[PDB]
């Protein structure tokens, strides 16, 4: 047996705690030399870290959609790899495959049925895009806008995006323009990200919530109010945005990342004053869970791919190398170190 590396849950930060690199631990383990019928041996190429993983660090995730990781057991999440050996009828050495529950380990023996083969032509050979813009975050943005945004044919709406330089947000803002908004404004956490948005991703304006006057800048950059809010963050930021939203406007309630490490359920309740405004102005604020639109994954991926290949959709990512950096990458992402999709490259081939 050859020795490979893997990552296990070392400790929990507590439901009110901050995640740190050291909640995870690297181990060296043997990889079995033989696989069974129906199984494949895969080499891991890229792994995703994503905010929802914070929940799997707790004893109770707070939702049936994801289960808690267990102390000292291998952790898992979105991944992409290449088949090294197959005893599954529909997979063959050299196929590129993805799983939602890829164990954080350099080489893995997996049930062939748990994997999906992917076509690298969809991403011009940039396989890591399958974990981001031409993956679940991209679908979340495209489907969320389609289903919850109500961007009418021929209209000239203003869209605001929170978490605007992250995975979902950076795509959402571009899609807002693609699909007919005349104004797209992003809110994000650094001046570097503001520049990215307006100089590369085509946002009409960007606001740094840590340093700028958010209400003031939204009044300046959204002179006709806000019709569509793609909300990744919640909290104080969303209160400020909602206060400037128009009658019959729409909140795409993607995530509420500002309410993490507090024991706060989703959808989190708007404060009394902000709920009053929401209701007065008939602002819609429904649950949105991308998995409820599985039937749109095919056209969604096909559209994301097309826009990318056309040079319209600009795909940003921040890649860190080495499985030993999974914990660091997750912590970094949670605290805003990522521009676009946070990726960890496990083998650079």
Ligand X SMILES: CC1(C)[C@@H](O)CC[C@]2(C)[C@H]3C(=O)C=C4[C@@H]5C[C@@](C)(C(=O)O)CC[C@]5(C)CC[C@@]4(C)[C@]3(C)CC[C@@H]12
DSSP-derived secondary structure letter, 71:
B
User: For residue 101, is the peptide bond before it cis, meaning its omega torsion is within 30 degrees of 0?
Assistant: no
Shortest distance (Å) from residue 306 CB to ligand X: 12
Annotated binding residues for substrate: 100-101, 289-291
Provide the mask over 137-156, with x wherever binding to ligand X is found by CB under 6 A and - wherever it is not: --x-----------------
Angle at 48 between CA 307 and CA 195, to 5 degrees: 55
Burial class (CB in 10 A: 0-12, 13-18, 19+), 1: exposed
- Out of 129, 203, 288, 308, which residue is the one contacting ligand NAP (CB under 6 A)? 288
Give strand pairing partners of 284: 250
Instruction: Return the one option of ligand X, ligand NAP, none that residue 7 interacts with (CB less than 5 to 8 A, by type).
Output: none
Q: Is 338 in the site for ligand NAP (CB under 6 A)?
A: yes
- Out of 232, 278, 305, 331, which residue is the one contacting ligand NAP (CB under 6 A)? 232
Rounded-to-integer distance, Cα 46 and Cα 37, Å: 26
Tokens at 225, concatenated: 């109010």
Burial class (CB in 10 A: 0-12, 13-18, 19+), 310: exposed
CA neighbor of 333 nearest in space, from 324, 322, 323, 320: 320
Instruction: Return the one option of ligand NAP, ligand X, none that residue 116 interacts with (CB less than 5 to 8 A, by type).
Output: ligand X
- Out of 3, 71, 289, 302, which residue is the one contacting ligand NAP (CB under 6 A)? 289
* Closer to ligand NAP by Cβ: residue 103 or 169: 169
- Say if residues 224 and 204 touch (Cβ distance below 8 Å): no
For residue 19, what are the CA distances in angstroms to 13, 56, 120, 274, 331? 6, 11, 34, 30, 6
Q: Which stretch binds ligand NAP (CB under 6 A): 35-43, 67-75, 152-160, 253-261?
A: 253-261
- Out of 149, 163, 300, 327, which residue is the one contacting ligand NAP (CB under 6 A)? 163
Q: Is 55 in the site for ligand X (CB under 6 A)?
A: yes
Rounded-to-integer distance, Cα 183 and Cα 204, Å: 6
CA 297, chain centre distance (Å): 15
Rounded-to-integer distance, Cα 212 and Cα 244, Å: 17
Provide the mask over 105-124, with x wherever binding to ligand X is found by CB under 6 A and - wherever it is not: -----------x-x------
Site for ligand NAP in 257-276 (CB under 6 A): 257-258
| Total interface residues for ligand X by CB under 6 A | 25
* Closer to ligand X by Cβ: residue 37 or 295: 295
* Closer to ligand NAP by Cβ: residue 288 or 308: 288
Q: Which stretch binds ligand NAP (CB under 6 A): 183-191, 213-221, 222-230, 296-304?
A: 183-191
Site for ligand X in 224-243 (CB under 6 A): none
Q: Which stretch binds ligand X (CB under 6 A): 39-47, 58-66, 216-224, 306-314?
A: 58-66
Rounded-to-integer distance, Cα 269 and Cα 169, Å: 22
Tokens at 76, concatenated: 């898992």
List interacting residues with ligand X (CB under 6 A).
Answer: 50-52, 55, 63, 65-66, 98, 100, 116, 118, 130, 135-136, 139, 255-257, 266, 289-291, 297-298, 301
């Amino acid at each position: 047996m050859m020795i490979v590396q893997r990552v296990v849950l070392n400790s929990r930060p507590g439901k009110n705690g901050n995640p740190v690199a050291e909640n995870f631990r690297m181990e060296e383990v043997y990889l079995p030399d033989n696989i069974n019928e129906g199984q494949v041996q895969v080499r891991t190429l890229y792994l995703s870290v994503d905010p929802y993983m914070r929940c799997r660090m707790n004893e109770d995730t707070g939702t049936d959609y994801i289960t808690p990781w267990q102390l000292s057991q291998v952790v898992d999440g979105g991944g992409i790899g290449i088949i090294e050996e197959s005893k599954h009828t529909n997979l063959t050495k050299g196929d590129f495959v993805t799983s939602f529950y890829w164990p954080w380990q350099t080489k893995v023996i997996l049930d062939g049925n748990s994997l999906e083969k992917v076509d690298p032509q969809l991403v011009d050979g940039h396989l890591s895009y399958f974990l981001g813009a031409i993956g679940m975050p991209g679908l979340t943005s495209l489907i969320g806008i389609q289903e919850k945004g109500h961007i009418t044919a021929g209209s000239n709406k203003t869209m605001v995006v929170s978490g605007a330089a992250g995975a979902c947000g950076s795509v959402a803002g571009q899609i807002g323009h693609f699909l007919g908004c005349s104004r797209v404004v992003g809110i994000c956490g650094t001046h570097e990200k503001c520049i990215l948005l307006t100089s590369e991703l085509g946002f009409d304006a960007a606001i740094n919530y840590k340093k700028d006057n958010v209400a003031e800048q939204l009044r300046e950059s959204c002179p006709a109010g806000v019709d569509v809010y793609f909300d990744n963050v919640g909290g104080n930021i969303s209160d400020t945005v909602i206060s400037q939203m128009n009658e019959n406007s729409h909140i795409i309630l993607c995530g509420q990342i500002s309410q993490y490490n507090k024991d706060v359920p989703y959808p989190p309740p708007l404060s009394p004053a902000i709920e009053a405004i929401q209701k007065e102005r008939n602002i819609t604020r429904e649950r949105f869970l991308v998995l409820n639109y599985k039937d749109k994954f095919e056209p969604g991926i096909l559209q994301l791919s097309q826009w990318f290949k056309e040079g319209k959709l600009k795909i940003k990512e921040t890649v860190i190398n080495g499985l030993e950096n999974m914990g660091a990458a997750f912590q970094s992402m949670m605290t805003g170190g990522n521009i676009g999709k946070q990726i960890v490259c496990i083998s650079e081939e």
